[PDB]
Amino acid sequence: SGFRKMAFPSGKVEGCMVQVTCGTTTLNGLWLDDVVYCPRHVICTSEDMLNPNYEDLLIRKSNHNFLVQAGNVQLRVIGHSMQNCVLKLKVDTANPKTPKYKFVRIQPGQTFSVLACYNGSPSGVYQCAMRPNFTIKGSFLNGSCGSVGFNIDYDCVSFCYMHHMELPTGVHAGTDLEGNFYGPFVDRQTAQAAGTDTTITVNVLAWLYAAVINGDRWFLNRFTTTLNDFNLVAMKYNYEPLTQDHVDILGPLSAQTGIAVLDMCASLKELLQNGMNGRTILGSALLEDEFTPFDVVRQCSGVT
Amino acid sequence: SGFRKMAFPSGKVEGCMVQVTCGTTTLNGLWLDDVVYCPRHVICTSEDMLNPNYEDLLIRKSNHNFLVQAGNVQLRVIGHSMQNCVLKLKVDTANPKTPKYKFVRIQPGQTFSVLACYNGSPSGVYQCAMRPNFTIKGSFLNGSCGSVGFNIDYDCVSFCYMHHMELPTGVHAGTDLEGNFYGPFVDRQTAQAAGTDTTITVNVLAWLYAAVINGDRWFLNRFTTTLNDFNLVAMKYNYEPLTQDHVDILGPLSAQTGIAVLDMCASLKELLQNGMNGRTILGSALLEDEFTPFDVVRQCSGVT
Ligand SMILES: O=C(Cc1cccc(Cl)c1)Nc1cccnc1
Numbered sequence: 001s002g003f004r005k006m007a008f009p010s011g012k013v014e015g016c017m018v019q020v021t022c023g024t025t026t027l028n029g030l031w032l033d034d035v036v037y038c039p040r041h042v043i044c045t046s047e048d049m050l051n052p053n054y055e056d057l058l059i060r061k062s063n064h065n066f067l068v069q070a071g072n073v074q075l076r077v078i079g080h081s082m083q084n085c086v087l088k089l090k091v092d093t094a095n096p097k098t099p100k101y102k103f104v105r106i107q108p109g110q111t112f113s114v115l116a117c118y119n120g121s122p123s124g125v126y127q128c129a130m131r132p133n134f135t136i137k138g139s140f141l142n143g144s145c146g147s148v149g150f151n152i153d154y155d156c157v158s159f160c161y162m163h164h165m166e167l168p169t170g171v172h173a174g175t176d177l178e179g180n181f182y183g184p185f186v187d188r189q190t191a192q193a194a195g196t197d198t199t200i201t202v203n204v205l206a207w208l209y210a211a212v213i214n215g216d217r218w219f220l221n222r223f224t225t226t227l228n229d230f231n232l233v234a235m236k237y238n239y240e241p242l243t244q245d246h247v248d249i250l251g252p253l254s255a256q257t258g259i260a261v262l263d264m265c266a267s268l269k270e271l272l273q274n275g276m277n278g279r280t281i282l283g284s285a286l287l288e289d290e291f292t293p294f295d296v297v298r299q300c301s302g303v304t
Numbered sequence: 305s306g307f308r309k310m311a312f313p314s315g316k317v318e319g320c321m322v323q324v325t326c327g328t329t330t331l332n333g334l335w336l337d338d339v340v341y342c343p344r345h346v347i348c349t350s351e352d353m354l355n356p357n358y359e360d361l362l363i364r365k366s367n368h369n370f371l372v373q374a375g376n377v378q379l380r381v382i383g384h385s386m387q388n389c390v391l392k393l394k395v396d397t398a399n400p401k402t403p404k405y406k407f408v409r410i411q412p413g414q415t416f417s418v419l420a421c422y423n424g425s426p427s428g429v430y431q432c433a434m435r436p437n438f439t440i441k442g443s444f445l446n447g448s449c450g451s452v453g454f455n456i457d458y459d460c461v462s463f464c465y466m467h468h469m470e471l472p473t474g475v476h477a478g479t480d481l482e483g484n485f486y487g488p489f490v491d492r493q494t495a496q497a498a499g500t501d502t503t504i505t506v507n508v509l510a511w512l513y514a515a516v517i518n519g520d521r522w523f524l525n526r527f528t529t530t531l532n533d534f535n536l537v538a539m540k541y542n543y544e545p546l547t548q549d550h551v552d553i554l555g556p557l558s559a560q561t562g563i564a565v566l567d568m569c570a571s572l573k574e575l576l577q578n579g580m581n582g583r584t585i586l587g588s589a590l591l592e593d594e595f596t597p598f599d600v601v602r603q604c605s606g607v608t
């Protein structure tokens with residue numbers, strides 16, 4: 001009973017957070033095995049951020065310039081390299097708390113948990129989605145740049161995001177753990193605008209199935225639609241087009257509820273056209289799009 | 305930048321979760337020092353839940369009937385006692401991962417994080433509030449009954465909730481860690497209804513201050529009000545009456561934004577009377593009441 005925006009338990013990731021300082025810049029790092037990963041802008045002063053030449057700025061840096069502290073104990077840096085927009089600092093000690101892990105590059109629409117940190121210390125955990133414009137709507141302040149996003153499959157942590165930047169509009173940009181930015185963003189103090197933040201249709205449908213499973217059924221209509229008809233309405237409302245791959249992934253939710261995917265599409269089409277009329281679904285007055293179909297199954301089945 | 309429903313990092317609590325089984329009933333327990341705390345209904349069969357006499361059912365139970373497993377290793381039970389609606393199982397081993405902790409009984413309107421668990425294993429973490437009717441709107445399934453709610457002050461975990469029950473309406477009830485239910489609920493399979501779930505006014509005001517700090521300012525009006533005038537409108541909209549104690553706690557947010565508390569009350573009064581007109585505040589189409597003034601300060605300042 002009930003449906004919440006739920007994050008993964010963060011303990012396995014808390015055990016990896018470290019503080020990285022270079023000169024007067026401090027941010028967070030992720031310590032896995034004998035490597036600490038952190039945004040490469042740790043080498044920059046605020047002046048350097050205007051137009052940084054990272055390869056050039058890195059020539060002035062040695063292993064001993066990167067101060068890495070895990071808890072209140074200093075780690076010895078024995079190597080450093082730049083991979084895209086991240087630095088990899090080789091330390092002389094493997095993190096004893098390194099969980100089983102993978103580095104994954106997620107697609108827009110995928111959700112993940114963020115462990116927001118400051119000075120290598122966790123402040124909180126929340127659930128995010130990679131937006132269709134490749135920004136995330138997080139909660140980050142100056143100093144949060146070490147922070148990572150991740151998913152867990154039983155005991156394996158798949159790290160998918162490292163936070164680098166806030167856009168002038170207050171939305172967030174970052175990279176995967178190979179240092180490649182999501183979207184077209186660059187790690188420079190230059191104005192960068194985000195594209196259309198469309199609604200993740202397959203996730204809204206998943207959340208309407210979660211609503212039916214939890215008893216919120218008022219929005220179920222007497223209609224059906226087709227993918228093409230639904231998509232004409234999705235386009236008009238800045239929703240992502242729905243494909244047969246999305247219909248396929250919704251199959252288990254359709255099976256569990258007995259509501260055909262296209263019938264749920266027709267109920268969504270009526271909600272878009274009629275609005276909520278002051279009503280709520282799962283305590284929300286808007287259509288929630290940051291639960292994937294897998295998230296709904298996981299939460300509704302009690303996966304640990 | 306950004307404002308999210310954020311939970312506390314859960315690692316310190318994950319280190320305390322255990323599985324407790326008695327007969328054919330399995331739920332979660334909280335292992336702190338050499339004591340495991342769990343709902344007393346672990347001793348009941350589904351038939352026993354209709355009208356349980358817990359003292360009588362406990363006479364048929366010995367230490368060896370309580371099976372406690374931490375990870376995949378069994379703990380030896382050397383004592384057991386009932387305190388209100390919880391059992392305290394004394395084990396022969398202190399939990400090596402016991403954090404600094406306190407047991408606190410929270411007031412309605414207070415928020416906390418929940419680490420939802422099944423079979424002593426964490427499934428996820430989310431943020432809750434103790435509702436004014438002493439229910440919580442969680443996300444819990446059968447088997448989640450060990451699960452706890454907590455707050456953290458730097459390194460000390462204050463446990464405030466243990467989950468026991470879902471009401472026929474799908475809202476949740478539980479106890480503090482001394483086993484006293486919040487509200488009038490009893491641990492029995494008998495229909496129990498909840499009272500009015502009013503809106504936590506001081507938390508909505510805190511969230512409107514978070515919205516102004518994060519750039520969402522459209523709702524700021526040219527008016528002010530008084531506590532008595534505001535409360536006439538709060539009563540009409542099923543909002544909790546605002547007191548001078550609530551105004552006092554909002555002082556830091558008023559100081560940080562330069563918006564007098566009563567002016568923010570007048571902006572809230574207009575939102576109640578006019579509605580949102582299809583607009584959003586912090587990505588919500590309703591007024592959010594599960595952030596306390598302390599939560600807003602903590603999140604907006606990056607407390608770790
Ligand atoms: O955005 C930055 C610093 C920065 C400036 C320019 C480029 C880069 Cl890569 C980083 N810090 C921050 C503040 C608030 C929330 N998230 C991040």
Ligand SMILES: O=C(Cc1cccc(Cl)c1)Nc1cccnc1
Pocket residue numbers: 001345353444445446447448449468469470471476490491492493494
């Ligand atoms: O409510 C119960 C079992 C129960 C029945 C009657 C009394 C008591 Cl104390 C417990 N389990 C559950 C299921 C879904 C969500 N939260 C809890």
